[PDB]
Amino acid sequence: GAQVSTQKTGAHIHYTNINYYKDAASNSATRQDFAQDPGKFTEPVKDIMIKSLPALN
Amino acid sequence: GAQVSTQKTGAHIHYTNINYYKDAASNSATRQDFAQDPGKFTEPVKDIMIKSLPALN
Amino acid sequence: GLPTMNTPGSCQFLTSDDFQSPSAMPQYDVTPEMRIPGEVKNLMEIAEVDSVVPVQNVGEKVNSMEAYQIPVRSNEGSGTQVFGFPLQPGYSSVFSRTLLGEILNYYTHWSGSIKLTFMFCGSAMATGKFLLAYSPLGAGAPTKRVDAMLGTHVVWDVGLQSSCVLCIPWISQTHYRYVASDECTAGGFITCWYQTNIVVPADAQSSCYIMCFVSACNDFSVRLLKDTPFISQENFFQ
Amino acid sequence: GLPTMNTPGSCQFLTSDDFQSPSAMPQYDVTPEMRIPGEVKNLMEIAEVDSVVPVQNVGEKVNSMEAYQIPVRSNEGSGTQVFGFPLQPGYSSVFSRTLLGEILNYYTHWSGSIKLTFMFCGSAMATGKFLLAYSPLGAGAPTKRVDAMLGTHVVWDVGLQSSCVLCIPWISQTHYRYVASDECTAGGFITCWYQTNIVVPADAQSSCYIMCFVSACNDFSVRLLKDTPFISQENFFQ
Amino acid sequence: RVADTVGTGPTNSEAIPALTAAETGHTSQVVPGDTMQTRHVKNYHSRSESTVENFLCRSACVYFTEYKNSGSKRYAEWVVTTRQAAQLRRKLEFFTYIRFDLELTFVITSTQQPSTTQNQDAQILTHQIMYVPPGGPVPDKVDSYVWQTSTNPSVFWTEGNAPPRMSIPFLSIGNAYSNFYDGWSDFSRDGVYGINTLNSMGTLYARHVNTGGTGPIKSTIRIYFKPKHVKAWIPRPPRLCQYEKAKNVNFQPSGVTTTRQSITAMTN
Amino acid sequence: GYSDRVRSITLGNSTITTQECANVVVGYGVWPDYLKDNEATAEDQPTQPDVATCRFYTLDSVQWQKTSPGWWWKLPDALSNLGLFGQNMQYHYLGRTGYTIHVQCNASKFHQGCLLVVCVPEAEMGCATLDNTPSSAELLGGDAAKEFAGEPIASGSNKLVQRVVYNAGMGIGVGNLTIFPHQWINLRTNNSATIVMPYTNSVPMDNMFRHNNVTLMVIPFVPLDYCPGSTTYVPITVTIAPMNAEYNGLRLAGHQ
Amino acid sequence: GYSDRVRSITLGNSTITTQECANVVVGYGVWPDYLKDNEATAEDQPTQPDVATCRFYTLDSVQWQKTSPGWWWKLPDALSNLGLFGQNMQYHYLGRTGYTIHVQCNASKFHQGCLLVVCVPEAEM
Ligand SMILES: CCCCCCCCCCCCCCCC(=O)O
């Protein structure tokens, strides 16, 4: 059961990976996980604030 | 004749295995055989006993 | 010749490794299998079976069969404590040598409930009521019956069925408690009290005995298997 | 036995290498995951959060909480300069210890805009107007308010909202500017001036303070991760 | 992919993007275009090195110890702790809670030690590393039964080839590793206080399997840690201080930052 | 119409009303909630005292002086002897709860000062002596505020928390306390700060007496200062309300 | 099969098991229940400690002598300093609750005695 994935390349090409162990802890790291969400740390406050309105009214 | 099986992972992912020998005694151990039955050692007695009835009547 | 790279750790020996190696004898014809009773697939099933507990493990008592027996007698005042032992099965002296404890000495982490079974061994005429209690960690061990009653407990009556089961609920912040004693996780305190004085007719013995049996419940589990502390050899045996 | 060739570099150890190796323990059952607040997926998200700036980092001021405070007072003549600091976050003393600067000390290249936030901390009655300006590289640092106005600037008024944001546009010939100071790429000069004299009623203090907050904008990015300069050990700790 | 700036044109308006309140604690989020006229620019920049996994997926040497083929100190024992190396400790400290698989590489180098003995002949040394879980019996001497390792994971290495490598599953009683614990070992609160209370990862033992030659040989074993499959939560500020012990966070007091000559001056 | 500044919070039989406030902050965007059955390690049913435990509790006020390094409170210790909530934890081995924090300071328009109200998970203070861990009495103050010291603790060979303000006791820069959830009280713009915290911990439930989850800290970045004849005493009051409090492991009272 | 005499009552974390018992008596044929909204005088929401308050509590035993006139207990006073239930009433101005009573005496077949266990509303001494 071979898996085909994209490679890390520049902008302005696939690598085959096969698991040979069943421990699942013997796999490679998940380097390609480019997801971010600053909503927790920034804009923590309950009532939402618009970009251009008086902050306190 | 490749065989695809699941890996050992946590809860709340497949490994390929190919046999290269015919002796059959050269294979890997069967670690993933999670079957249990305490009925032999516990509740050995012929007449079945219910969880909440007087044990002797 | 396909090009190949060598990974770090090539030509190394790991005790717990699973690989394919060539048989010493080719095409051996193995002897046919036959039906055998009591087949075993899991260690836990052996731990589920009850094991006698040497509760009175003091001095000469371990040397005699008196270790297993727990003394009880008719007494002037109700509320005296029959016995007290640590909750954990693995480290405590009382549960260390039992079936479940011996299996645990093999594994680093343990999880789930323990069933304790108590069988009265007195005359038919003898009658009595005892209070068996488990107290949750972080509270000093109960020193009186009133304190013990606050901890979850089962009141037992002698007569009719002659055995009782106190089931200790798992109450741990952690999913797994170390078999080795841990300051972070304290299993609990288990103690027994007289709910009422033992009563006997004239010509019947005042003092009787109570045996204790300890086993793994259905929820029980283990992890991180390790070498056992008890077995050691100075030299290879002959 | 398939024929195989060995590549150059076989049996070598690379710190940053990604390969498959056999587990020390076979089939371990890992503890189940549970929900935790403030989960982190990217370092940049931490840099977006504002960090207090020790703008007055001179002498005794770093030892007291006076480092963060910037002094302001009513003055006879308008046009005096409140403060001046280097644009780059990584090398400059003023931004080196801040959240964004500390993350940058870890990475060799940095890219994108910086948001600077200024909050007046004076009495309600106190009023004033200040001019916050950024001057593009290759021009000597502004020495007068007229020179500063030529560089892009935001005129701020105290009262109503008590905080202002000066956003520094990225203006670099290169896509990436080195975190380490580079002769080739000079980030810029950031300076503040009095647009008008601070005015206060009798019984209100003439002198107030202004705190500064520094953060990565949405366009900000980093590359070539490297060991940080600040952390060092003479010996392993015990 | 990094967000790309939008082109803007001059306008006079009631709306006030630059004006905001620090008191709310909601970080201001304003683009360069709101403050000044800008031009439409496309960005191909990628936030692909800031990911927590990329930042923490590199081998670092946590600790090294020395043992001798002859003399009193036959074997070396090290308790397994992340804290004793500053670089590994500082990056782990960046998150309060971390969950991660561990990759272990051991590098062993043997140096001949000068001696009075002559015409020495040296067969290739073989080195054994054995890891013991809490409560496993410790070896008391190099020739002990403990060295059989029937119930203990163990690796044997022959000098002159690739360093031995193993993968470790996430081992914790807890759902996640705790970088900082604000707690006492006991209910009373009289006792050791710190992360050391949650410290029970076991111990590692290294010995010469065999002695090739009469002369004394000293072997250094270096242990390397590489986080894998990383998961983080509750991020913490940068430490900002030199470390002092691996059992506590005790610190000599430190100035906030390096000091420039004047507030106006651009020179550090 | 309505005002963003005006607010009214009602918990149990206690209601809080401030004419002026900065927008309320939820620290990780998560409201406090009762524990899931899927995530629950303990078999025994939990006991939920509901409104009894979940009410505002007012602590002893402190005096803001022109030279006060800082004031800090260990929150679990703060409510350890207050009402039914103090009684329930003493009775029970395991407790998990959300916490509502409300810090109120009142000053004249002429007054000028800025206080930083930050709640930090797992803050570990470090002892002034390197070879000794900090004492429990120094670490936690019951019924009384513990105060930061502007100067570093002097050389010593005894247990003593290191209180220098810039390190904040954690040996980390004071300015970077922004990453922890926080709310700024500026006398010209804000009357009081409200922070709501989701329960945070690796374990689902933990014994409250042995372990403290979060620590409320107040530090003035800008010193209080006023012209002569103005009120010279300023009072800061901390009110804390438990949220969705639940208890397990019914046990005899007291800790040892 | 089953026995009328054997019984097992489980309340909170306390379980009571007697091999021999007379049939259980409900005094007026009414099970204890929480108060109805239709019948409730007080506007404020009530607090229900659930299992904490609702568990068996064991009192100090007495000695039955050949000449003991009698023993009597005021039940609300009996549990006034016992566990969370003693704490809740001390904290709260109004409390209404059902009560389970279990009186246990053990004797040899040869022994002979008869005890009357009666609960009386509003007894005024
Ligand atoms: C067989 C030889 C190797 C033995 C490896 C044993 C397992 C070591 C695991 C260490 C994990 C450290 C995690 C971070 C620090 C901590 O939480 O204690």
Count interface pairs C-G at CB distance under 8 A.
64
d(CA E249, CA F126): 5
Vertex A54: Cα angle to A52 and A56 (nearest 5) = 140
Non-local CB neighbours of E45 within 8 Å, separated by 6+ positions: D111, D112, D175, D219, D221, E1, E2
Spatial contact of D192 and D71, defined as CB atoms under 8 Å apart? no
Centroid of ligand 1 to alpha carbon of E172 (angstroms): 9
Evaluate the CA torsion angle G115, G116, G117, G122 in order and state its sign: negative
Residue D139 near residue D124 (C-beta atoms within 8 A): no
Rounded Cα distance between D60 and E243, Å, is 24
Contact E222, E84 (CB under 8 A): no
With CA atoms as reference, report the closest residue to E134 among C105, C14, C47: C105
Query: Coil, strand, or helix at residue D192?
Result: strand
Helices G83-91 and F83-91 pack at an angle, to 10 degrees, of: 180
Q: Å from A54 to nearest chain F CA?
A: 10
CA distance C192 to C79: 10
Angle formed at CA A31 by CA A26 and CA A35, multiple of 5 degrees: 130
CB A28 within 8 Å of CB A17: yes
Other Cβ atoms less than 10 A from the Cβ of C25: the count is 7
Please count the CA atoms within 13 angstroms of the CA of D33 that sit on its side-chain side: 17
> Domain span at residue F192?
7-250
Tell the burial category of E161 from Cβ atoms under 10 Å away from its Cβ (0-12, 13-18, 19+).
Answer: middle
| F245: Cα within 13 Å, side-chain hemisphere | 28
Please report, for residues D174, D222, E11, F241, F245, the alpha-carbon distance to residue E33 in angstroms, rounded to integers and kept in the order given: 20, 22, 12, 43, 47
CA dist list (Å): B6 to A18, B50, E166, E167, F220: 13, 39, 21, 18, 58
Task: Give the closest residue to F152 by CA, choosing from C117, D160, E251, E222.
Answer: E251
CA dihedral of residues C85, C91, C95, C99 (deg, nearest 10)? 160
Cα C14 to chain centroid, rounded: 33
In sequence order, the 6+-apart residues with CB closer than 8 A to the CB of G93 are none
C117 strand-pairing partners: C165, C213
Q: Tell me how far CA of residue F99 lies from CA of C159, E238, F84, F249, G98, in angstroms.
A: 53, 26, 16, 21, 34
Q: What is the DSSP letter of E125?
A: P
Residue closest to E28 by CA, chosen among D57, D164, D93: D164
| Residue with tokens 């002296």, as numbered in its chain | C93
Which position has the token pair 């014809």? C29
Min Cα–Cα distance to chain D from A5, Å: 15
Answer whether F27's CB lies under 8 Å from F120's CB. Answer: no
For an interface test with F, the pick among E19, E20, E24, E198 (most F C-beta atoms closer than 10 Å) comes out as: E24
Cβ contacts of C92 within 8 Å, gap of 6 or more: C85, C86, C101
Nearest C-alpha in F relative to E240: F172
DSSP code for E248: -
AA letter at D174: T
Non-local (6+) Cβ contacts of C35 within 8 A are none
Give the β-pairing of C221-225 and C107-111: antiparallel
Residue E97 DSSP SS3: strand
Q: What distance in Å separates the CA atoms of residue D180 and residue D172, rounded to the nearest whole number?
A: 16
Distance CA D160, CA A54 (A): 8
Chain E partners (3+ C-beta pairs within 8 A):
A, C, D, F
**Best of A40, A42, A43, A45 to disrupt the F interface by mutation (most F CBs within 10 Å)?**
A45
Q: Which runs of E-coded beta strand occur in C26-185?
A: 51-52, 71-73, 81-86, 107-111, 114-120, 127-135, 153-157, 163-168, 177-178
Whether D86 and E267 have beta carbons less than 8 Å apart is answered as: no
For residue A20, the Cα-to-chain-centroid distance in whole angstroms is: 26
Three-state secondary structure call for residue G8: strand
How many whole angstroms separate alpha carbon C146 and alpha carbon C195?
11
d(CA E22, CA E35): 18
Distance CA B4, CA D75 (A): 81
How would you list the strands of the sheet with C177-178, edge to edge?
Answer: C177-178, C107-111, C221-225
- Angstrom CA distances, C230 to C101, E168, G104, stand at 12, 27, 47
Structure tokens at C157: 């009556």
Residue nearest to atom 4 of ligand 1 (CA): E131
The total of structural domains in chain F comes to 1
Q: Which residue has the tokens 């076979």?
A: D26
Query: For A49, which residue in chain E has the nearest alpha carbon?
Result: E26
Count chain D–chain F contacts defined by CB atoms under 8 A.
Answer: 98
Q: What is the DSSP letter of E198?
A: G
- Whether chains F and G touch (3+ CB pairs under 8 A) is answered by yes
Q: Which amino acid is at E1?
A: R
What is the Cα–Cα distance from C201 to C206, expressed in whole angstroms?
9
Q: How many CA atoms lie within 13 A of C5 on its CB side?
A: 9
Q: How far apart are CA E56 and CA F75, in angstroms?
A: 33
* CA-derived radius of gyration, chain A: 21
In E247-266, the residues whose Cβ lies within 8 Å of chain C are: none
Contact D210, D106 (CB under 8 A): no
Angle at C162 between CA C158 and CA C168, to 5 degrees: 90
**Within a 13 Å sphere around the CA of F162, how many CA atoms are in the beta-carbon half?**
30
DSSP class of residue D101? Answer: H
What's the gap in Å between the CA of C173 and the closest CA on chain D? 13
User: Least CB-CB distance to D164: which of E18, E83, E235?
Assistant: E18
Instruction: Tell whether F2 is covered by a domain.
Output: no
Which H or E run contains C148?
Answer: helix C145-150
CB contact at 8 A, G84 and G53 = yes
Beta bridge partners of F250: F92
Cα–Cα distance for residue pair F35/C101, rounded to 1 Å: 33
Residue of chain D with shortest Cα separation from E78: D238
Identify the CA nearest to G33 among candidates G48, G55, G18, G23.
G48
Q: Which amino acid is at F223?
A: P
- G13 contacts chain F (CB < 8 A): yes
- F111, two tokens: 């007054």
Q: How many CB atoms neighbour CB E237 within 10 A?
A: 23
Nearest chain C CA: its distance from G13 CA (Å): 5
State how far the alpha carbon of F244 is from the alpha carbons of F34, F49, F55, F199, in Å.
6, 9, 10, 10
Amino acid at site C199? V
Nearest to C180 by CA among C115, C228, C232: C228
Are F104 and F239 in contact, with CB atoms under 8 Å apart?
Answer: yes
Do the beta carbons of residue E137 and residue C229 sit within 8 Å?
yes
For residues G13 and A43, give the distance between their C-alpha atoms in angstroms, rounded to a whole number. 46
Asked whether residue F256 is assigned to any structural domain, the reply reads no
Round the CA-based radius of gyration of chain C to a whole number and report it: 24
What gap in Å lies between CA E236 and CA E240, rounded to an integer? Answer: 12
Greatest CA span in chain B, whole angstroms?
A: 62
DSSP state letters, chain F: ---SS-EEEEETTEEEEESSBPPPEESSS----PPPTTT----SPPB--TTTTSS-EEPPPEE--TT--EEEEEHHHHTTTSHHHHHHHHHEEEEEEEEEEEEEE---TT-EEEEEEEEEET----BSSTTSPPPHHHH--SSS-EEEBSSPPPS-SS--B--BTTTTTTTS-SGGGGSS-EEEEETTT-SEEEEEE----SSSSB-TTTB--EEEEEEEEEEEE--TTS----EEEEEEEEEEEEEEEE--SS--
In angstroms, the CA C67 to CA D125 distance is: 86
Torsion sign across C-alpha atoms G83, G87, G88, G90: positive
The encoded tokens of residue G87 equal 């704490």
Q: Does C45 sit within 8 Å of B37, measured CB to CB?
A: yes
Candidates F112, F105, F109; CA nearest to F223 is F112
CATH of the domain at F213: 2.60.120.20
Give the H/E segment covering residue G89.
helix G83-91
What is the Cα–Cα distance from D108 to D106, expressed in whole angstroms? 7
CB contacts under 8 A, C 165-224 vs D, are: 175-176, 221, 223-224
Phi then psi for residue E208, to 5 deg, are -75, 120
Domain count, chain B: 1
Q: Using the beta-carbon criterion (under 8 Å), do G106 and C199 form an inter-chain contact?
A: yes
Best mutation site among E62, E63, E80 for ligand 1, i.e. most ligand atoms within 8 A of its Cβ?
Answer: E80
For residue E177, give the ligand 1 atom closest to its CA: 17
CB D153 within 8 A of CB E9: no
- Angle CA(G97)–CA(G103)–CA(G107) in degrees, nearest 5? 175
The closest of A1, B18, E101, B32 to C19, measured between CA atoms, is B18
Q: Is G51 exposed, middle or buried (0-12, 13-18, 19+ CB in 10 A)?
A: middle
Let me know the angle formed at the C-alpha of C133 by C129 and C135, rounded to the nearest 5 degrees: 165
On whether residue F95 sits in a domain, the answer given is yes
User: Which domain range does residue B56 map to?
Assistant: 1-57
Contact B20, A37 (CB under 8 A): no
> Residue C142 carries which DSSP code?
P
Q: Could you say which DSSP state residue E183 is in?
A: B
**Strand G14-18 to strand C153-157: parallel, antiparallel, or no bridges (unpaired)?**
parallel
User: Could you please report the per-residue DSSP string of F176-205?
Assistant: GGGSS-EEEEETTT-SEEEEEE----SSSS
- Structure-token pair, residue F155: 């050389």
CA distances from E192 to C66, E195, G26 (A): 41, 10, 56
Residue F185: inside a domain: yes
Torsion D15-D17-D22-D25 (CA) sign: positive
Angle at E113 between CA E108 and CA E118, to 5 degrees: 130
Question: Domain limits of chain C?
Answer: 1-238
Q: What is the CA radius of gyration of chain B?
A: 21
How far from D48 is each of A12, F190, G75, CA to CA, in Å?
27, 24, 64
Q: Which atom of ligand 1 is nearest to the CA of E198?
A: 18
In units of Å, what resolution does this entry have?
2.5
D74 with D198: CB under 8 angstroms?
Answer: yes
A43 vs E: CB within 8 A: yes
Q: Are F2 and F8 in contact (CB under 8 A)?
A: no
Residues of C in contact with F202 (CB under 8 A): none
Q: Minimal Cα distance from C126: which residue of G?
A: G108
Cα G63 from Cα G106, distance rounded (Å): 12
